[PDB]
Design a protein around this ligand. Sequence first.
Ligand SMILES: NC(=[NH2+])c1ccc2[nH]c(-c3ncccc3O)nc2c1
Ligand SMILES: [Ca+2]
Ligand code: NA
Ligand SMILES: [Zn+2]
Ligand SMILES: [Zn+2]
Ligand SMILES: [Zn+2]
Lengths: 250, 36, 11
Amino acid sequence: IVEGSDAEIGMSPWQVMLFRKSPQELLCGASLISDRWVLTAAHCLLYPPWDKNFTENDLLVRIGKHSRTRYERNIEKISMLEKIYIHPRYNWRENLDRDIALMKLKKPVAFSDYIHPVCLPDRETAASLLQAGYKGRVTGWGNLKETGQPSVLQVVNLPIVERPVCKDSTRIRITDNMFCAGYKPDEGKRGDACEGDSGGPFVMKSPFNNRWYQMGIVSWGEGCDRDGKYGFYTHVFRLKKWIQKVIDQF
Amino acid sequence: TFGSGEADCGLRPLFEKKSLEDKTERELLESYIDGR
Amino acid sequence: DFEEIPEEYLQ
Ligand SMILES: NC(=[NH2+])c1ccc2[nH]c(-c3ncccc3O)nc2c1
Ligand SMILES: [Ca+2]
Ligand code: NA
Ligand SMILES: [Zn+2]
Ligand SMILES: [Zn+2]
Ligand SMILES: [Zn+2]
């Protein structure tokens, strides 16, 4: 996360860290939505241009973390995966459309003051909150600059941007399954997610019922925090029917 | 299950459950044209 | 720079 701050303890109890077993490295962010399911971006796992095609046995999911590099004994939990599901229509070939993947944990995790799931939005919440100008929050242990990595979880609050503006900031084709967020050069505020933050959650807090809903998944962006560019996020609600299907079928 | 989710979702033990606010959530609620 | 975690999670 670029131009963000250190999160507070228990600020994002649904944040998950996808860790590789060999080498042992931070792969991406993800979120806990159930005691058994984790949501992430599909390019964190499959991205053929760079030969990434990770399987269950190559990953560990660490939940309850704050510190990036330390094993927070008695606080964090590490789970193994049973299955990984990538959206059958994830478009890695062109613009990472439907960049979403679900992972089933081997065993349920128990909630604590540092581990708790985030809610997934319903048509109404999506409608009233996914409006340009409204701010969401992204969290992660990814790069701090484009070209180092933080000691603890970082947070940055960014506004959603009007679709026309997103389309006009790039050559890439934006679909209705994505939304963009970030500040305009003439706003005087910065911030963005960066490499290492993909897969993590873009959440908003409902003013009606005070719950945090995950509206997006950090997907791509051209560089990190460049002026005139924005970060793109997978639109969770548009892909919720797929999410449901996988969870009440497997 | 979904419809809503894990029922007690989105409520953080260290914040909402204790009615404590984190330091920048105000910024989000204010951008929704006054969250109160 | 990651710290080692319990062998029981590599398996
Ligand atoms: N500036 C950003 N909002 C951003 C965030 C995460 C990214 N992840 C990637 C990414 N892109 C292509 C292949 C692998 C990646 O991790 N680009 C990214 C750009
Ligand atoms: Ca109310
Ligand atoms: Na920008
Ligand atoms: Zn990425
Ligand atoms: Zn990129
Ligand atoms: Zn007013």
